[PDB]
């Protein structure tokens, strides 16, 4: 069973998978709260403990509904209020502020940056245009065994 | 038997298995509590030795089984209690205190980050401007032999 | 639905992504402030919650949008403004005082370099075709086996 | 007849065989205890030298199977009810205990992370943007001989 | 939409892309100076946004381009008589005095390196062709494992 | 002759021959005890040599069978049965008192490992996640000749 | 138009195109000292700034030129007296004393060369002999799993 | 002659030759005794010299077959005695002494390993799976230019 | 039209074009001694200042082939013979004293280097036999994904 | 004429050539004494100066083969005879004496060997499991551009 | 015309062409002595300048030959016979007492090498065994695009 669904999830996509691109993520997608993962087992259950198990589940996911129910209503509702307040000031200096700071800064970066590539470069790239010619004059001589078999499905 | 089975099982899928993307996983689907596996054997027993390993195995299964279960009955019903009010807890708070934290520390770090990128790069680039040539000029002399065998199954 | 949509998205295009060949970019376009992402929740929520989060999405919602509409009205309206004043400034002076800047620094520096440049690589270079001769006289000897199964889907 | 068998044996599977993903195995199974493996000889023995190696055979062999036959009922028997009574113990907290304080650790280490995350990368990344450079600019020319020889089996 | 152009545009050419060929360029291609990237916005505004964008939007520009306009008519036209009379006598220095100097310099360089890299080569290249004699002697076990699928579209 | 066989050996199987997966091997397999081999030659014998070789090759093999044998005969029938003895116990130690004790200590290290896992990755990681960035922005330019000859066998 | 003419142009020659072989070049192909180049623009101008280009770029232009004429007319006409009587002393002195120079320090250099190569080699190769044995023993298990799409056009 | 049989021999097998999977093999297989080797000549003799060559080479080969069948003869005798008896105790000793020991040095380290094994990794690990983090990321631009030639022999 | 028939002569031949296999070569043909190479101009010129470029070119060219001639004849007349003379012993002394010389230390070399060779390896190469072990036991495993898009012209 | 033999000689085979396999080689075969090797020539003599060699090479050759045969004869007689008795008792020491020294030692160390390789790698082993995990996670994201040309001879 | 040819030449063989294989080779194939070579010129001669050159080669190459014919007749004629002389008595030497040394040496050096590698082996192998798990467990991913265009010529 899980390992054939496994290794058909994995045939899907084969290419690269990582999130190296984006520096401002959350980590919440990797967490697992219930109760066959806060309470692990070793090995396969029998009948005979399938029934603690069953009464042990009720009640802690019960207990632990209510009291998110009850703070939620009963404190979520202010910090709703409050987090809105300053998100609106944010979001206003974002737009109104920083952007118009980061656009002349870049005027001013963008003026000086040419001058100070081509003096530099002018002066230092002999220096590795002659050591390019160690990469020159490689020689390979190449000699090969094989067997092969092959299916047609 | 057992080799035959092994090979069927690494034939179905060859590529990569690791698991480095999560950081927040347990061990536990590596353990194996089992007679056979927690008393090992060097060698096939004989017809004479079978019967010791069968007066063992059920007594130390029934051992085993018998504390399990009495300690689940009796102490796990207050423990699954006491970890239900403390997760709940734990869910209101990540939901209700630690996103909006993260988000207004996102917005306070998007703001200064492009204008410390711009300023650093126009002034450091030239330097690796002028080591990229040391890769230019590459030239490669090749030759080779080869002999193939092959079949159609 | 997720993961399906997700692997479609990927399939399109298996190339570079990169962004380093521009210098001058915002981060912007990483964030998001809505409700959903701002108070994020470990597990799916049941009917009885989908109410409290449903009462405490408007009033996070309505908040945050008045208070920048507020803002931007009253305060936005000078911004833009005193902005553009100091931005048709920085235009006038890039394209009239920058520009012939470098232009005739291209000049005074393109005049001098290719002297260095020979001078330095007539004396250099000779140490480096000596080095050349390290990557000759390479041989290889290979061996190979090989299985593969193939389909037409 | 051996190496056959051992080539027969290498050509079912040319794939990867190493076993680093488990951190939690036991080594029993490279082990071989019998009298040809533990009286090892170093070339073939003669009719003449078969007789004493027959008999000296089964000394060793009903020697070590007496010895082990007496200790495993008269002792392994008290060893099985010991080792049952401390690993239900052990199966108790595992399940009870250790998955819950892992549980809530998660929870407190991933409402941390992201800040620290943005934060050092916003810092540090252009120092290799800017390093990145090097690895353009690379030119490769190549020329080839080649022979080549093969068959349909 | 957005995606979608991004892509077709990507898939056009899929080569190097790089311009450290070129030691003597501006950075002015990279700059974007208008309102909906001057002033950026973290989501989607509404229609009740949209109104104070569109003020806003014409307030900005006209002052930005009256500025612009009134000092290029009655400062640029100087700047252009002054910069031109400098740029005339650059390019007949240009043409008239650094050429010759450089081909002078050219002449006689040329005259003396090949006895300095005869010399240093007679001398030095021994060392390296000892060293080559390290890259011989390889040899290569290879076994593989393989599993293809593919369609025609 | 000899070289002939020696290549039908060689090209039945091209694969990796390595051993180091086994730790607990002996080495015998290597050894040979032989006339022609215990008393080299370096040059092909003549008739006039090839009967002092045979002389000396019975009485080598023959003492060295006499002793051997005796040996065998009078002190290895000793050797079985205190071997043996001491074998027995050890099977006996190795099933009923390391596996229990390696199972114990399994359960006790994989209930700490994932807190002090996920703890030093949340803090380490960015590091490398910035030094990621230098890989990026790879770019080649590659030119080719070649010239190729083939026979079907 | 821009894009595409530029792909038209990157797809004619894909191979490379450095240019280290030459130590004895100009810099002047890079330079572009024309109004559009001179005085650039940061986004495109409207036809109310049309009109204010048009007017700088002739008075530019026309200074430009002029000031070149009259300096190449009364100035350049010496330059060019001046320089030919000095290259054509050093074309005299290249082709009349440095090749001869050359030529017998190449004869001198030719007949050392040969014996202290064989003196250092006969001295130093096996140091190198011996280290190459450490790229033998190479040995590779590999696995592989692949998707393809293709297209005529 | 001799370079068509030397390249008739290398084109039989192409493959790896290496021998360090052996670590108890002589260095006899390499020797050459015989007068063409033993006085070697530098150049074509002419058939004034092949007398004088012909005269030496039977006084060479006469003196150097009567020694060696004298001595092996009245002194091999004795030799072949005295290995025989030390290489008769020393099978025994191998056999009765040597693998005994070493089988029960093997299960005495079996026993230990897999709980040291377990405690290092998992304290050590993370510090190797945070640097995995350095090798995702990676992206390469290519193009290419190609000629071919081929033919059917 | 330039850029076509560069396209075109790069086109013709792709491979190596390195010339560090000759140690005794001269620089003569990097050098261009024109007055469209002398006096470079940084942009097309009109056909008003074509007229002054025609002057300038007569004057230049007259001059310089003027004083080449007149040196040439009334002083190249002597250093050819004075070269010839030393020129003629220099072969002289190539022939009959280098070249014995270097054979005779050839034959001095030749007859010591192989006792050192062996008896340097003897000692040495079971250190480098050991570090072969390292790069055994290589383990890949692999995934793909592709897409590929073709014409024929 | 040269360089076509050249050609051919070596398109026959393309691959290793290297001979460090053999530890116990001369170096003769390099060798060249023959007049025209002797006495090398800068450039194609002509007729005129033919005569000259003709006298010379006689003279040359003539000498030498006449003090050659004359040493060979009177001191060539005396040296075979000598060489002769002391390569006899070499060959009887090699054989007798040494090789059975070596066997001897091989048994006395391999009984040895495999403790000490299981000790040491039991301790030793898992701290390059865990270095293991540095090369997993790799991901490359990979783009391509081609022209190809080719013919049929 | 030059070029053409030059790459006729590049194009019959494109294998390697090193030299190092031989350690005892003269440098004489590099060199050319002849008036176009000598006294180089750094542009094409016109007709007025080629009478000039016309004179200066007769004179050079008639004294050179002149002095070389001298000295060879006159002086080589005593160099032949003394240089003969010695290389009779070098040829003697290395026949009749460097290679009878060399082969005792190869005697005395082969008895010994294997003990010695035996025993370093033995202690020193596990130390490179252990180190080899480093290069297991590696893993891939990999995604691609690409075009094609090719011809048929």
């Given at each position: 069973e899980?390992?054939?669904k496994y290794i058909e999830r994995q045939?899907?996509?084969?290419?690269?998978?990582s999130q190296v691109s984006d520096a401002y993520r959350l980590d919440?997608?990797?967490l697992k709260i219930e109760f066959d993962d806060s309470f692990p087992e070793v090995s396969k259950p029998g009948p005979a403990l399938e029934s603690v198990r069953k009464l042990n589940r009720i009640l802690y996911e019960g207990m632990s509904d209510?009291?998110?129910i009850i703070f939620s209503l009963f404190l979520?509702?202010?910090?709703?209020?409050?987090v809105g307040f300053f998100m609106g000031?944010?979001?206003?200096?974002?737009?109104?502020?920083?952007?118009?700071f980061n656009q002349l800064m870049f005027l001013l970066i963008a003026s000086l940056a040419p001058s100070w590539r081509a003096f530099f470069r002018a002066g230092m790239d002999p220096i590795f245009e002659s050591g390019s010619l160690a990469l020159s004059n490689i020689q390979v001589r190449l000699g090969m065994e094989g067997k092969a078999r092959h299916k047609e499905l």
């Amino acid at each position: 069973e899980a390992e054939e669904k496994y290794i058909e999830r994995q045939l899907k996509y084969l290419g690269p998978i990582s999130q190296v691109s984006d520096a401002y993520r959350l980590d919440t997608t990797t967490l697992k709260i219930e109760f066959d993962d806060s309470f692990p087992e070793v090995s396969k259950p029998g009948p005979a403990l399938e029934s603690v198990r069953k009464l042990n589940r009720i009640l802690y996911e019960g207990m632990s509904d209510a009291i998110h129910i009850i703070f939620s209503l009963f404190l979520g509702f202010l910090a709703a209020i409050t987090v809105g307040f300053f998100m609106g000031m944010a979001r206003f200096m974002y737009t109104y502020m920083a952007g118009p700071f980061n656009q002349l800064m870049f005027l001013l970066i963008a003026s000086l940056a040419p001058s100070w590539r081509a003096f530099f470069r002018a002066g230092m790239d002999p220096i590795f245009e002659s050591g390019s010619l160690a990469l020159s004059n490689i020689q390979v001589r190449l000699g090969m065994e094989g067997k092969a078999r092959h299916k047609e499905l």
